[PDB]
């Protein structure tokens, strides 16, 4: 029932479309920067030179504790990329554990489609493993340094909180967007039980999906297709991204379930918004979506179920009218499944690195209505789940 990490509760701001960020300080004296929380990468980097979208940036010449690694680094993401210079410096998380650590920092000097206008963040915190760090795995990720240099338990958990309606930059600034609990699990952030799935391999936070349902109906594909090439949990990706074949089958089924209303192809491709008169969004015509994940017990699985309140992303109207509008936050992928922010907004997610597993529980801040709620349920007797993993 009780929440025991109050200092870190509500330490995030942001929204699915622009990322969730936590305040951090780098250097001596401390330079404050807003840093996006990215479980899909492993490099800690911060803008280190002016940019149209940055209000502030890291000034190495003003930090007495700055150490130059004299080495360049380049990091490309599914969308966006940056070029930077490596070094180390002291880092702290004001609303985080009360420790300061020396960590690797890539000072971003050039970038393309990386920073977002009005996002309010100026850096990125890649929380995944060394295996995918650039230039290579010799560059210790921030979380690893943190755990090696302190007594912080080797675990962190994320409660990303979507508002369910749009927020402009000033509202994002003044609102709580969630929590990143470093070193533990805060029980006030979820309801029900935590169910855990194994981390298949420590590079991205990779998991195995063994079954997919749309309003209880089995998509009925070879489960290998669901993880075709990999399935990862990524706080830095807006959408639920699915391998091309799974995306097409899912969209067909979601269109069939919501067919009482018809939407332009642009809507299903994630490109155009759809609007309804204030308060009339027809939540009940859209289906719930269930992802079944391999359990920790042999032949056991559990499922996490989200609502259209999670996969329909609120966006501001073209004329900022009083209509309630959204974009379809499910899109195709050529690099496997990505359980992005719209999935994470339904749940409290525990990245239990020490025990190589990821925990899911219904979030205390997930958006829902009076008829349905997100769910995490189990167990289900499931067979040959490792066959679902792609090699």
């Amino acid at each position: 029932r009780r929440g025991s990490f109050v200092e870190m509760v509500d330490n995030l701001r942001g929204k699915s479309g622009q990322g969730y960020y936590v305040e951090m300080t780098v250097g001596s004296p401390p330079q404050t920067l807003n840093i996006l929380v990215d479980t899909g990468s492993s490099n800690f980097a911060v803008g280190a030179a002016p940019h149209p979208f940055l209000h502030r940036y890291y000034q190495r010449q003003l930090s007495s504790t700055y150490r130059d690694l004299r080495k360049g680094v380049y990091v490309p993401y599914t969308q966006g990329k940056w070029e930077g210079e490596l070094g180390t410096d002291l880092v702290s998380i004001p609303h985080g554990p009360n420790v300061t650590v020396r960590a690797n920092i890539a000072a971003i000097t050039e970038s393309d489609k990386f920073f977002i206008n009005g996002s309010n963040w100026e850096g990125i915190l890649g929380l995944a493993y060394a295996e995918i760090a650039r230039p290579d795995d010799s560059l210790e990720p921030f979380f690893d340094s943190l755990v090696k240099q302190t007594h912080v338990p080797n675990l962190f958990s994320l409660q990303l909180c979507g508002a369910g309606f749009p927020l402009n930059q000033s509202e994002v600034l003044a609102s709580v967007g969630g929590s990143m609990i470093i070193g533990g699990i805060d029980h006030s952030l979820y309801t029900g039980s935590l169910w855990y799935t194994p981390i298949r391999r420590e590079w991205y936070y990779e998991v195995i999906i063994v079954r997919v349902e749309i309003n209880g109906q089995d998509l009925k594909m070879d489960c290998k297709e669901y993880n075709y090439d990999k399935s990862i949990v990524d706080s830095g990706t807006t959408n639920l991204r699915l391998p091309k074949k799974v995306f097409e089958a899912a969209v067909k089924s979601i269109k069939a379930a919501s067919s009482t209303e018809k939407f332009p192809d642009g809507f299903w491709l994630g490109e155009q918004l759809v609007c309804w008169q204030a308060g009339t969004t027809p939540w009940n015509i859209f289906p719930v979506i269930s992802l079944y994940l391999m359990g920790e017990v042999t032949n056991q699985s559990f499922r996490i179920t989200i609502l259209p309140q999670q996969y329909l992303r609120p966006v501001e109207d073209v004329a900022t009218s009083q209509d309630d509008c959204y974009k379809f936050a499910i899109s195709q992928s050529s690099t496997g499944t990505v359980m992005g922010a719209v999935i994470m907004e339904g749940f409290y997610v525990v990245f239990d690195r020490a025990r190589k597993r990821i925990g899911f529980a219904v979030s205390a801040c997930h958006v829902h209505d009076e008829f349905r709620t997100a769910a995490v349920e189990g167990p289900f007797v499931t067979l040959d789940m490792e066959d679902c993993g792609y090699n």
Binding site: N43, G80, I116, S235, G236, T237, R241, S334
Partner: peptide, 7 residues
């Protein structure tokens, strides 16, 4: 939209 390390 954000789509954060390559592929």
């Amino acid at each position: 939209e954000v789509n954060x390390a390559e592929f």
